[PDB]
């Protein structure tokens, strides 16, 4: 059965609830991304409205098959009303058609719902500036102070100086880089620029990001590997047995590769800076595991919420044991004391 956090209280509303077959008394049903935790559940035999970003519509339609009769796609940045009740859609810095979603509740209490998102300084100049917000669904995933990450833009940095240093120095070797859902495509693409390369993936990755909106994206990505130095695979096949085997599929044509794995986060964070990373190595092959996130920092997240001064939080992540919770809960109480609200 859906559970308390997914449903918006005062509409038929709910967010990111497609598991549960037909929820009591939901009229519409909001998706704020395509990652599968959150879409799990939709298909071609879909026939209730879902309203998203447009990116997410193209992606509902292309790789789903959703019938387009019943994706409502909106616009972001723009008041809108569905089944009675004004909503904004907001971007979330988190993966391509990501967005946060403000309700403006028929008795006057505003909600914004977060979906998955990376807090930043920015959003406190959208339409969140102009009012205030009784209740916030946040995106807990590392709500806890040893979650400290560098911005995306040093880590871009050193994947990019990495990758040029190391082709330059062997113009045979080959850089992979692994993926298993859209978000963090700026890893590969930024490689492959600096490169003077297009990036290689199957015909299946290269359908999924035709779908995003990237500009100048025919430009970036390929179908035909042998024309590629980046090539994109399965995160799954990051690995020592998996890379030899790609290598050998290349004919010769390269003898060492240069891997990278975008992780979330990992504790080597909580005693290495960025530019101290180093990669595991076996033979003519190395790993470098790079913490590129798209979720909130602790300390990106507590400012946020000190900025927003909301009079409820609701966690939507780690929400499932009792010591999780009440770390949580101390959490929010320690910002409200800091910040005086
Ligand atoms: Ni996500």
């Given at each position: ?101 403000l309700f ?5 209490t505003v909600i914004l ?15 969140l500036?102009?009012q205030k917000v009784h209740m916030l ?171 927003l001064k909301p009079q409820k ?29």
């Amino acid at each position: 059965t859906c559970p308390f956090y997914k449903k918006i209280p005062g509409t038929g509303f709910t967010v990111d609830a497609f598991q549960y077959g037909v929820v009591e008394g939901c009229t519409a049903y909001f998706l704020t991304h395509f990652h599968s935790d959150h879409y799990a559940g939709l298909s071609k035999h879909f026939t209730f409205p879902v309203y998203c970003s447009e990116i997410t519509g193209n992606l509902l339609k292309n790789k789903l098959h959703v019938q387009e009769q019943y994706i409502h796609p909106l616009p972001l940045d723009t008041e809108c009303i569905v089944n009675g009740v004004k909503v904004v859609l907001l971007d979330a810095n988190h993966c391509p058609g990501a967005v946060m979603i403000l309700f403006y509740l028929p008795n006057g209490t505003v909600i914004l719902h977060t979906g998955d998102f990376r807090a930043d300084p920015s959003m406190e100049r959208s339409l969140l500036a102009d009012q205030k917000v009784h209740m916030l669904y946040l995106d807990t995933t590392y709500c806890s102070p040893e979650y400290t990450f560098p911005s995306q833009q040093e880590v871009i940095r050193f994947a990019i100086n990495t990758a040029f240093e190391a082709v330059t120095l062997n113009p045979h070797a080959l850089v992979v880089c692994g993926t298993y859902s859209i978000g963090k495509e700026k890893v590969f693409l930024a490689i492959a620029d600096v490169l003077g390369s297009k990036v290689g993936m199957s015909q299946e990755k290269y359908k999924t990001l035709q779908c995003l909106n990237i500009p100048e994206i025919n430009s970036l990505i390929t179908t035909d590997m042998c024309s590629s130095l980046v090539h994109l695979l399965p995160m799954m096949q990051i690995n020592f047995k998996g890379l030899q085997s790609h290598l050998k599929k290349c004919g010769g044509k390269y003898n060492q590769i240069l891997a990278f794995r975008p992780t979330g986060w990992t504790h080597s964070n909580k005693f290495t800076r960025i530019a101290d990373v180093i990669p595991q190595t076996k033979g003519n092959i190395s790993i470098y595991g790079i913490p590129y996130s798209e979720h909130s920092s602790y300390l990106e997240m507590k400012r946020f919420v000190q900025w927003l001064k909301p009079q409820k939080i609701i966690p939507t992540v780690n929400v499932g044991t009792w010591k999780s919770r009440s770390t949580m809960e101390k959490y929010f109480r320690e910002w409200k004391l800091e910040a005086g609200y």
